[PDB]
Amino acid sequence: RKLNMSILINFLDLLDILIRSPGSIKREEKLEDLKLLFVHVHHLINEYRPHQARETLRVMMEVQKRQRLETAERFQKH
Amino acid sequence: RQLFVRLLALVKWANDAGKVEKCAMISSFLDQQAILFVDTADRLASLA
């Protein structure tokens, strides 16, 4: 998140520079380097990290069954 | 007489044609650099 904020700030600074000094022709080349960062962005913010935590939740899944077993304990109370 | 006056006016206008073309080329180069920078920034933003 800090890197994304820094990238947004750097994009604003580059836009201000292009508005103030438009003679830069290599800036677009940096976008190609962003492709490398895009690799990391392939796991950036949306829908891939929580699955890892789901691993731990897997154990909790059986705990959910234990919760059902808790209800089954009522049968013993019967 | 009108044709000769028109030719004289054209010669007087073309007397500074070198400086006119130089300034026009400088302005065109500056505008092209600005447009290229703006287009590169817009393309990078649209890609991201």
Resolution in A: 4.7
Q: What angle do CA B31, B33, B39 make, to 5 degrees?
A: 100
Count of Cβ atoms closer than 10 Å to residue A71 Cβ: 8
Q: Which residues lie closer than 8 Å to A25 by C-beta, 6 or more apart? A: B36, B37, B40
Residue A31 to residues A13, A22, A27, A59, B41, Cα–Cα distance (Å) = 15, 17, 7, 43, 9
Looking from the CA of A76 toward its CB, the CA atoms found within 13 Å total 6
| Nearest chain B residue to A7, by CA | B48
Q: Which amino acid is at B14?
A: A
Count of Cβ atoms closer than 10 Å to residue A78 Cβ: 5
* Tokens matching residue A40: 């990391």
User: What's the maximum distance between 2 C-alpha atoms anywhere in chain B?
Assistant: 66
CA distance B40 to A29: 9
Residue B34 to residues A11, A12, A29, A76, Cα–Cα distance (Å) = 17, 16, 17, 81
CA distance A47 to A27: 30
Residue A14 contacts B, CB cutoff 8 Å: yes
SS3 A25: coil
Residue A34 contacts B, CB cutoff 8 Å: yes
SS3 A48: coil
Residues of B whose CB is below 8 A from A22: 30, 33-34, 36-38
Query: How was this structure obtained?
Result: cryo-EM
The answer to whether the CB of B31 falls within 8 A of the CB of A22 is: no
CB contact under 8 A, B37 and A34: no
Secondary structure percentages of chain A, helix, strand, coil, to 5 = 80, 0, 20
